[model samples]
Target: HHHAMDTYKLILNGKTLKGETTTEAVDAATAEKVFKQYANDNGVDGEWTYDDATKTFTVTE
Candidate 1:
Protein backbone atom coordinates (compact mmCIF):
# COMPACT_ATOMS: atom_id res chain seq x y z
CA HIS A 1 0.00 0.00 0.00
CA HIS A 2 1.09 3.55 -0.59
CA HIS A 3 2.17 5.78 2.22
CA ALA A 4 0.01 8.73 3.13
CA MET A 5 0.66 11.85 1.11
CA ASP A 6 3.22 14.32 2.42
CA THR A 7 2.75 18.04 2.64
CA TYR A 8 4.90 20.41 0.67
CA LYS A 9 5.02 24.12 1.39
CA LEU A 10 6.44 27.02 -0.52
CA ILE A 11 7.66 30.05 1.33
CA LEU A 12 8.54 33.21 -0.52
CA ASN A 13 10.26 36.03 1.32
CA GLY A 14 9.27 34.52 4.64
CA LYS A 15 5.58 34.35 3.74
CA THR A 16 4.04 31.01 3.05
CA LEU A 17 2.47 30.65 -0.38
CA LYS A 18 -1.13 29.49 -0.47
CA GLY A 19 -0.44 27.09 -3.32
CA GLU A 20 1.15 24.58 -0.95
CA THR A 21 0.27 21.00 -1.82
CA THR A 22 0.75 17.34 -0.92
CA THR A 23 2.49 14.70 -2.97
CA GLU A 24 3.68 11.09 -3.02
CA ALA A 25 7.29 12.27 -3.12
CA VAL A 26 9.36 10.91 -0.27
CA ASP A 27 11.39 13.53 1.62
CA ALA A 28 12.65 17.08 1.78
CA ALA A 29 15.56 16.43 -0.60
CA THR A 30 13.21 15.21 -3.33
CA ALA A 31 10.71 17.94 -2.63
CA GLU A 32 13.53 20.49 -2.76
CA LYS A 33 14.49 19.41 -6.27
CA VAL A 34 10.94 19.49 -7.54
CA PHE A 35 10.15 22.86 -6.03
CA LYS A 36 13.46 24.37 -7.08
CA GLN A 37 12.91 23.22 -10.66
CA TYR A 38 9.44 24.70 -10.59
CA ALA A 39 10.94 27.99 -9.55
CA ASN A 40 13.64 27.79 -12.17
CA ASP A 41 11.18 26.97 -14.95
CA ASN A 42 8.81 29.73 -13.87
CA GLY A 43 11.45 32.38 -13.21
CA VAL A 44 10.75 32.54 -9.53
CA ASP A 45 13.87 33.98 -7.96
CA GLY A 46 15.38 33.69 -4.51
CA GLU A 47 17.88 31.90 -2.31
CA TRP A 48 16.26 28.53 -1.75
CA THR A 49 16.30 26.58 1.48
CA TYR A 50 14.86 23.23 2.46
CA ASP A 51 13.65 21.55 5.61
CA ASP A 52 11.68 18.43 6.32
CA ALA A 53 9.39 18.66 9.31
CA THR A 54 8.24 15.17 10.03
CA LYS A 55 6.07 14.30 7.06
CA THR A 56 6.08 17.84 5.72
CA PHE A 57 8.71 19.23 3.39
CA THR A 58 9.17 22.97 3.03
CA VAL A 59 10.82 24.91 0.24
CA THR A 60 11.56 28.55 0.92
CA GLU A 61 12.72 31.11 -1.59
Candidate 2:
Protein backbone atom coordinates (compact mmCIF):
# COMPACT_ATOMS: atom_id res chain seq x y z
CA HIS A 1 0.00 0.00 0.00
CA HIS A 2 1.10 3.55 -0.74
CA HIS A 3 0.95 6.42 1.64
CA ALA A 4 -1.04 9.54 0.95
CA MET A 5 0.92 12.11 -0.98
CA ASP A 6 0.48 15.77 -1.71
CA THR A 7 -1.35 16.80 -4.87
CA TYR A 8 0.03 20.06 -6.11
CA LYS A 9 -2.02 22.58 -8.00
CA LEU A 10 -0.25 23.55 -11.19
CA ILE A 11 -0.53 27.17 -12.19
CA LEU A 12 0.98 28.59 -15.33
CA ASN A 13 1.11 32.33 -15.11
CA GLY A 14 -2.32 33.32 -13.86
CA LYS A 15 -4.18 30.31 -15.18
CA THR A 16 -4.45 26.82 -13.81
CA LEU A 17 -3.21 24.18 -16.21
CA LYS A 18 -5.70 21.36 -16.41
CA GLY A 19 -4.63 17.80 -15.63
CA GLU A 20 -1.21 18.92 -14.55
CA THR A 21 -1.47 17.67 -11.01
CA THR A 22 1.25 15.13 -10.31
CA THR A 23 0.70 11.65 -9.03
CA GLU A 24 1.68 11.03 -5.42
CA ALA A 25 5.34 10.31 -5.60
CA VAL A 26 7.73 8.99 -2.99
CA ASP A 27 8.61 12.56 -2.10
CA ALA A 28 8.11 16.15 -3.20
CA ALA A 29 11.67 16.37 -4.48
CA THR A 30 10.98 13.52 -6.87
CA ALA A 31 7.69 15.07 -7.91
CA GLU A 32 9.34 18.44 -8.49
CA LYS A 33 11.97 16.89 -10.71
CA VAL A 34 9.34 15.13 -12.76
CA PHE A 35 7.34 18.32 -13.12
CA LYS A 36 10.34 20.46 -13.95
CA GLN A 37 11.43 18.04 -16.66
CA TYR A 38 7.89 17.89 -17.99
CA ALA A 39 7.70 21.65 -18.22
CA ASN A 40 11.05 21.92 -19.94
CA ASP A 41 10.22 19.15 -22.40
CA ASN A 42 6.86 20.76 -23.14
CA GLY A 43 8.46 24.17 -23.65
CA VAL A 44 6.90 25.74 -20.64
CA ASP A 45 9.06 28.80 -20.12
CA GLY A 46 9.01 30.15 -16.63
CA GLU A 47 10.43 29.74 -13.17
CA TRP A 48 8.69 26.93 -11.37
CA THR A 49 8.13 27.29 -7.66
CA TYR A 50 6.59 24.73 -5.38
CA ASP A 51 4.95 25.71 -2.11
CA ASP A 52 4.85 22.97 0.43
CA ALA A 53 2.41 24.78 2.68
CA THR A 54 -0.09 25.37 -0.10
CA LYS A 55 0.86 22.37 -2.19
CA THR A 56 0.86 24.41 -5.35
CA PHE A 57 3.37 24.95 -8.14
CA THR A 58 3.25 28.29 -9.89
CA VAL A 59 5.16 29.04 -13.04
CA THR A 60 5.81 32.62 -13.98
CA GLU A 61 7.75 33.97 -16.93
Candidate 3:
Protein backbone atom coordinates (compact mmCIF):
# COMPACT_ATOMS: atom_id res chain seq x y z
CA HIS A 1 0.00 0.00 0.00
CA HIS A 2 1.05 3.54 -0.69
CA HIS A 3 0.32 6.83 0.98
CA ALA A 4 -0.75 10.07 -0.66
CA MET A 5 -0.13 13.68 0.27
CA ASP A 6 -3.13 15.68 1.42
CA THR A 7 -3.62 19.16 0.06
CA TYR A 8 -5.50 22.22 1.21
CA LYS A 9 -7.13 25.22 -0.46
CA LEU A 10 -6.81 28.96 0.19
CA ILE A 11 -9.91 31.12 0.17
CA LEU A 12 -10.38 34.90 0.49
CA ASN A 13 -13.70 36.23 1.64
CA GLY A 14 -16.04 34.61 -0.90
CA LYS A 15 -13.40 33.95 -3.50
CA THR A 16 -10.90 31.22 -4.29
CA LEU A 17 -7.35 31.99 -3.24
CA LYS A 18 -6.30 28.49 -4.29
CA GLY A 19 -3.47 28.96 -6.76
CA GLU A 20 -0.01 28.65 -5.37
CA THR A 21 0.30 30.28 -1.97
CA THR A 22 2.43 27.20 -1.64
CA THR A 23 4.01 27.17 1.79
CA GLU A 24 3.54 24.89 4.74
CA ALA A 25 0.83 26.72 6.74
CA VAL A 26 0.63 24.70 9.96
CA ASP A 27 1.07 27.48 12.53
CA ALA A 28 -0.41 30.91 13.36
CA ALA A 29 2.84 32.85 13.08
CA THR A 30 3.78 30.94 9.94
CA ALA A 31 0.28 31.30 8.54
CA GLU A 32 0.46 35.07 9.23
CA LYS A 33 3.57 35.43 7.13
CA VAL A 34 2.24 33.01 4.52
CA PHE A 35 -1.15 34.71 4.32
CA LYS A 36 0.32 38.21 4.17
CA GLN A 37 2.15 37.09 1.08
CA TYR A 38 -1.04 35.60 -0.28
CA ALA A 39 -2.85 38.91 0.27
CA ASN A 40 -0.04 40.75 -1.41
CA ASP A 41 -0.02 38.29 -4.30
CA ASN A 42 -3.79 38.17 -4.69
CA GLY A 43 -4.60 41.75 -3.59
CA VAL A 44 -6.62 41.01 -0.49
CA ASP A 45 -5.80 41.57 3.19
CA GLY A 46 -6.73 40.78 6.78
CA GLU A 47 -6.88 37.51 8.71
CA TRP A 48 -6.51 33.75 8.14
CA THR A 49 -8.38 30.95 9.82
CA TYR A 50 -8.10 27.23 9.12
CA ASP A 51 -11.02 24.87 9.33
CA ASP A 52 -10.13 21.42 10.58
CA ALA A 53 -13.39 19.89 9.33
CA THR A 54 -13.41 21.41 5.85
CA LYS A 55 -9.66 21.23 5.32
CA THR A 56 -9.40 24.74 3.91
CA PHE A 57 -7.97 28.13 4.83
CA THR A 58 -10.41 31.02 5.16
CA VAL A 59 -9.42 34.66 4.96
CA THR A 60 -11.36 37.76 5.89
CA GLU A 61 -10.73 41.41 5.13
Candidates 2 and 3 compared: the better one by TM-score is 2
* Backbone clashes counted, model 1: 0
Which segments of candidate 1 are over 4 A away from where they belong? 1-4, 14-24, 54-61
TM for every model, in the order presented, reads 0.54, 0.64, 0.48
In candidate 2, the residue pairs with backbone N, CA or C atoms under 3 Å apart (3 or more residues apart, or in different chains) clash, namely none
Per-residue error for 48 in candidate 1, Å, reads 1.9
Task: Put down candidate 1 lDDT per residue, 16-37, tens digits, no spaces.
Answer: 3434545456566676777777
In order, what lDDT does every prediction score?
Answer: 0.58, 0.67, 0.59
Candidate 3 Cα outliers beyond 4 Å, as residue runs: 1-3, 14-36
For model 2, the local distance difference test gives 0.67
Better of 1 and 2 by lDDT: 2
lDDT of 1: 0.58
Q: Rank by TM-score, descending?
A: 2, 1, 3
Least accurate 10 contiguous residues by lDDT in model 3: 14-23
RMSD of each: 4.1, 3.8, 5.4
Kindly indicate the candidate among 2 and 3 with the higher lDDT.
2
Tens digits of per-residue lDDT for model 3, 1-61: 4543445556666254444333454544565566667577776755778776755677766
Q: In every candidate, how many clashes are there?
A: 0, 0, 0
